[PDB]
Design an enzyme around this catalytic site. Structure first.
Site: not given
Ligand SMILES: O=C(O)[C@@](O)(COP(=O)(O)O)[C@H](O)[C@H](O)COP(=O)(O)O
Ligand SMILES: [Mg+2]
Ligand SMILES: O=C(O)[C@@](O)(COP(=O)(O)O)[C@H](O)[C@H](O)COP(=O)(O)O
Ligand SMILES: O=C(O)[C@@](O)(COP(=O)(O)O)[C@H](O)[C@H](O)COP(=O)(O)O
Ligand SMILES: [Mg+2]
Ligand SMILES: [Mg+2]
Ligand SMILES: [Mg+2]
Lengths: 461, 140, 458, 350, 229, 140
Positions: A167, A193, A195-196, A286, A326
């Site tokens: 992040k 990783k 971020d998506e 993802h 969250k």
């Molecule tokens: O972008 C985000 O929020 C995360 O990188 C988590 O960050 P944090 O650990 O900082 O919250 C993931 O992509 C989420 O888990 C996606 O949700 P899911 O796994 O339900 O698809």
């Molecule tokens: Mg993410």
């Protein structure tokens, strides 16, 4: 005498509602949560769905006689009313295996969820489950590696795996990205990783990132003496780009890449899984955009279906949700689709939303990944829900630590290792959860600084 | 704010981030192994062949993804099949550490259903080993 | 300085005083917070977690300029006639997005936010794609003008037809049905969206026979003919193999299911179509999973803008009057978004932003699904000349077969065009035009007879 | 030659017993990728049989376990291990996974023993493209040797692979899976000597020759004959050995006979007596069946073979003093002793 | 119980299971078995099932690392043959997991790979195989099939007529084409290279292909019927 | 049940499925043209060059997708820019048919905003033409 061509509209239920049908072992079965318009008989509505997702249109066509409608038609074969619901039914449709292209999730979705959801004759539709028979399952390459092989390649046993999304999501340069990556990885995380949505952007071009991350991976691995990974993102606008990036990852020797299977798409995804199988890359999936489809109870596709789909298309990891973090995730349903992801054979169990016995006929298992708004306090709950075969991810929960990434990583690793030991020692994590964490905070300064900062933080509404 | 040290803080997978296991905490894990029906086994390696490296990749093309040397350790006798006796495992740990006092030694267990190693932790670090830290000096 | 721990999103990501920049991508979310979550905080969570932010404060923020890169919730309207529903407005800097990648844009904008515990439901109603982002896309392979120029067809809607039954036909029969439909006066026939390659009919066998039909009908009618051969497939390599074969066969047009295929495969195919002069027909299979409900999902206008960017020559627009849902005003709006170069904000049509497509070719709307000859005037009225109208059952459901079925529809369409052109108001004298034509054409008369009573109203 | 005639109504049975491949035809074949001499030179192994070992169970083992077994066998003193003929790529173990782990095992055992090691990774596959894909990966991994099932794979695929091996310096081990369907009966089929000449022409560095004494059929005199046909440059007609024609191989390299299947340490002297140095002897069960595991199992067989070789060299007649040489060695080697103990009673006579 | 016990034992102990219910996905083989005198049929059947699946001649320790139950071939039924002293039909069931998807080669390698050469039997014949749908679905199968062929060729409602050019070997490419043209124009649908006509000194393949192509097209223009070779 | 004839039932794009246009139906179209600001123009072709074919594709590789000969006809004079006089258009149709009595002739109109031909229909078929059917003999 006979059965000839009669032009004009008739009811669907005449051809497509067959409650006396014995389902065959090779049929694909669907479970729809149908909500007809007022005055549309359930039997007719279900037959419409079966028809327009298989062989039928709105008026009678003559070409039917050239072929055997019996052999090929989709068949609504059972309707349950939904308890506590005036106008809601579960419609069961059976589709012959012949209807489907071998190895093609894309084709299966196109038939089953192609048009029907948009019918005027219904208010809402939701696909809750599919029964993918062995004989269709065996046509898919499926996951590149699966849980066992992944664990063997990585040489990691007897605990969950620890990951971490760098992040801020966007905005970091390639050099800084690798910097963060190195610091998280050396503290004791197994993976970090992209971020998506980190792909290739003006602030950070993908090849710059891949190079710096590779260096971070190798520094951290040499320092800790434990195998390290970072899911470099191959999600791209075109297949050609997506492949370019996978190839580069392979060329760097890094162990693992990631794909956003729903925003990239099933076609692109199956391609990548095949590439990963062919080159020994681990593929982290993802599920970006799933909630657009699977959030509401009345309409859409339930995630357990999107997960069977990814398992067939191909992936080594799939995000499963956290329950406690969250983002939404009810516990019982989650335990169900995790079984669907991981296991060889999953018996029908309605308390868990599993409408069908699913026999995966040796297709490897996908590792659930629990991520998003979790921190050290959640650790025991997570180990309790998922067991060893999962990967837990702490983005904020690592780069949010007051001492930085290495301490952040160390905290989480201790937290997990503590619960695992406790679990193994006989301690029940569902009850003594908070105790195990507390013992470990008074023991580890890094964990303690972590516990202190996120002690009040919960996600309940 | 404490700083996590890069020198020489080499870890060892599962449980190496906790305080070193007491002879009884080791025994507790062995109970968990036999409790679940899993096959116990001992592996060992000399000081060099202990850590993950890649010197055989000098012989490779572009195919060194998920290839690392020294994943494999050397098997101590055989794995103990249907041997449901916690006592006898702890005895083999001793026999092994005795025969290779200078080796790394780890205990592992296989599940034969999933066909995978299901747990594994270190039981002996050699005495000469200068590349690890005690649990308290990991941050300065 | 760096302050560890959770704090409110609104502190950083709610900025109601922000002036949007000409290059920002703007999203219009239909937000539905959980009880007791203030609108401002929900809007800021969405802005955050689709751009730069996570749940607790991270130190790495200082390394970069969050001001430059953050998504910004910059306006909140309450929804009239609604207790707990708001329209949240988010602005995303252009730097957030990969050039030319729809997939990336969706990953950011709809990636995670829809799943947040802190909200009940979310719906993306519109995006403003700024010119400087639009210029980064190859866009449609051809666009309406060029397609019309390639096909040599002007001054009327185009006529298509899905072969039925959807699945079940052999390649040989597929081509047979195709030839009969095409020779009766339809411009196009198509593979059904789920016709790919299956045990009952393998794709290459179908492609060959279809080619043959297309050429027979073309030689017979002396009009240019086409059949949308389906390139949708399991893997990009299969998708491409099929496109290449279509090219090799000289056929003018292929189709793709962009949503079940996926944007990445789709953009790949659009680019192939640009590079080899193939027309690309886009089928929107699966859209209604995402766009049907008012409370939650992505509205179709956004899926349409998205396809325009990824690339397609045709995109299914819905019928309004046929067997699948489609409200009239909203449809007229997204058709404008598909076709036009410049589309002014118009809330009465669901258009939340002025969209300037800065010369990106327009996509042709395709109206298909449970429509027959009686609908003709209503269709010609809604869509005008620049549309494709499709009659699957409407053709293979005619009592005298495909050729007559086709002729019927062709006559019906031509009649309404002449009438429109002659000054007749189609919204009123609709039924009259059709009726005159039935008394005139035997084939049309047989069609009117069979579907006279058939309507789709609920 | 064997296309249609075997099916004629006008005959009850037909058997092809031998072929005389003339030099002018022989010269049109690439033949074996390497041959005995070159193989020995490449491997740096001289003056004894080579020792191999099929991993067991045939099917069911994961890639990681496969590699584990391989490492243990190889470090005990075996030269080679191998995929079982039917180990290709399956749900329980996908080929690329296996190739990678086996490569690692090969390199560990090699560094540990200081002797060159190999494992016959199986390239047999459904299509030529797949077969090639696997060969290429083996090359890419630097491993010395692959295997192919030439009869179930087929001659066309096999010759392709042999040429690939020649072009990339891979040793090619040939498994004769399915031969017995064709060569078992005396009245009908094709005799193995013909299937061996064929393989020599198509190409292979090793070919399974049978054991005589192990679990699968093989008469002694006929075997000595076709082994000569596999290895030698010139083989004179000799009807006592089933050799109907003088065969001149005109310098085509020789194929190494591999003796495998139901053999153990007690067979060692008989085996060394039959084949001499230029053979490869394989102990699957004979290794993974040892009570102390693979490394000991390997050590046992290696000692057994080295003892018989020394004995042979020292003048001792192995056909008579056979049991003596083995016995001396058991009283000397603990690992061999444990082996002799377990398979002492075990014989294959009917 | 159940640890590692070195040494030979009987195959029947692990590989003869006459109480086994075959699964819908198992490949089943029907072998015409002829054991050596004094080898019990049950043991000979289990030997076949073992050595065509997971088993070797002595016990191996590695069995414990996997689940033999899951993977083993099973002899599950033995019929005696009427009018036969020492001949049985043994039935073997193999789990689908044993086989490579799409590979006939792999299938034959397991099923008919080694067992036919066992000392413990006089003779063996594989009479039939039950290829289960879930295995069949992994094959591309025939390129076209009867229906599609007929449709391609536009030939319906009668047998198709072919003809192998003769002499088998010896004809030049030009003569080959000549003969081909004469046979096709007579009203045969197909002519063909003899199975051993490949490419030889008297007639190289590419030469033949070119002349045959010409014969095919002349005959096709002359008769108005579709022609092949 | 009537059968639509394959011989010789050649069509001609827009309006060729209706009954042939009366001198006044033609005039009504021209009103529509002028009413909308569109540019009128006349194109013609001799009996051969009238139908879509592909004899130039003998010169091509695999690139004959959406290439057909005889899309282009010969322009009569020039397009009539800003000419807002329906009378003068009809006069030009007459001028052209008079000059080429044996040609196919079609009236077309261009929108210059979208830059595309926005309508087009046939106005003269040559007399020798034997490859069309009167509106009533299209089905037997
Ligand atoms: O972008 C985000 O929020 C995360 O990188 C988590 O960050 P944090 O650990 O900082 O919250 C993931 O992509 C989420 O888990 C996606 O949700 P899911 O796994 O339900 O698809
Ligand atoms: Mg993410
Ligand atoms: O499968 C079908 O139903 C169609 O072939 C229409 O057939 P008919 O003409 O016989 O009704 C189209 O795919 C639908 O129009 C899709 O709907 P939409 O255009 O809204 O995406
Ligand atoms: O599958 C087997 O049985 C083997 O792996 C031997 O295993 P063991 O050493 O454990 O018996 C070999 O493939 C046989 O030698 C084949 O026979 P042949 O050499 O006659 O072709
Ligand atoms: Mg359709
Ligand atoms: Mg074998
Ligand atoms: Mg012949």
């Amino acid at each position: 005498a006979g059965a000839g061509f009669k032009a004009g509209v008739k009811d669907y239920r005449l051809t497509y509602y067959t409650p006396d049908y014995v389902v065959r072992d090779t049929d694909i079965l669907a479970a729809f949560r149908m909500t007809p318009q007022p005055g549309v008989p359930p039997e007719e509505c279900g037959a419409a769905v079966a028809a327009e997702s298989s062989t039928g249109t709105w008026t009678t066509v003559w070409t039917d006689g050239l072929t055997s409608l019996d052999r090929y038609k989709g068949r609504c074969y059972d309707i349950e009313p939904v308890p506590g619901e005036d106008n809601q039914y579960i419609a069961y449709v059976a589709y012959p295996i012949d209807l489907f292209e071998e190895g093609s999730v894309t084709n299966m979705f196109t038939s089953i969820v192609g048009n029907v959801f948009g019918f005027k004759a219904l208010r809402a539709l939701r696909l809750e489950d599919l029964r993918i028979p062995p004989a269709y399952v065996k046509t898919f390459v499926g996951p590149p590696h699966g849980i066992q092989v992944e664990r063997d390649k990585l040489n990691k046993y007897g605990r969950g795996l620890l990951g971490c999304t760098i992040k801020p999501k966007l905005g970091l340069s390639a050099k800084n990205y690798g910097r963060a990556v190195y610091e998280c990885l050396r503290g004791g995380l197994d993976f970090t990783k992209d971020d998506e949505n980190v792909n290739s952007q003006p602030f950070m071009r993908w090849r710059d990132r891949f190079l710096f991350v590779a260096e971070a991976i190798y520094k951290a691995q040499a320092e800790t003496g434990e195998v390290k990974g970072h899911y470099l993102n191959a999600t791209a606008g075109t297949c050609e780009e997506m492949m370019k990036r996978a190839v580069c990852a392979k060329e760097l020797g890094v162990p693992i890449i990631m794909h956003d299977y729903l925003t990239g798409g099933f076609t692109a995804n199956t391609s990548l899984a095949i590439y990963c199988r062919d080159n020994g890359l681990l593929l982290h999936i993802h599920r970006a955009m799933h909630a657009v489809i699977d959030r509401q109870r009345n309409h859409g596709i339930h995630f357990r279906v999107l997960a069977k789909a990814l398992r067939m298309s191909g992936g080594d990891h799939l995000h499963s949700g956290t329950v406690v973090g969250k983002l939404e995730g009810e516990r019982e349903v989650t335990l169900g689709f995790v079984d669907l992801m991981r296991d060889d054979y999953v018996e029908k169990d309605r308390s868990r939303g599993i409408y069908f016995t699913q026999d995966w006929c040796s297709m490897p298992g996908v590792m659930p990944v629990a991520s998003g708004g979790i921190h050290v306090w959640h650790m025991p709950a997570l180990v309790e829900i998922f067991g060893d075969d999962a990967c837990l991810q702490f983005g904020g929960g690592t780069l949010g630590h007051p001492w930085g990434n290495a301490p952040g990583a160390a905290a989480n690793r201790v937290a997990l290792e503590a619960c695992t030991q406790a679990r193994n020692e006989g301690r029940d994590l569902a009850r003594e959860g908070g105790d195990v964490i507390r013992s470990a905070c008074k023991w580890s300064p890094e964990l303690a600084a972590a516990c202190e900062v996120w002690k009040e933080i919960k996600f309940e509404f | 704010m404490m700083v996590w040290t890069p020198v020489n803080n080499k870890m060892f997978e599962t449980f190496s981030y906790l305080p070193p296991l007491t002879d009884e905490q080791i025994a507790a894990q062995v109970d968990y192994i036999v409790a679940n029906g899993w096959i116990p086994c001992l592996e060992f390696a000399e000081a060099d062949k202990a850590y993950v490296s890649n010197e055989s990749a000098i012989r490779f093309g572009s195919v060194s993804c998920l290839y690392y040397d020294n994943r494999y350790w050397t098997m101590w006798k055989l794995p103990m099949f249907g041997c449901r006796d916690p006592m006898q495992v702890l005895r083999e740990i001793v026999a092994c550490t005795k025969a290779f006092p200078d080796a790394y030694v780890r205990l592992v267990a296989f599940d034969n259903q999933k066909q995978v190693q299901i747990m594994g932790f270190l039981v002996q670090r050699p005495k000469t080993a200068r590349d690890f830290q005690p649990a308290n000096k990991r941050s300065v």
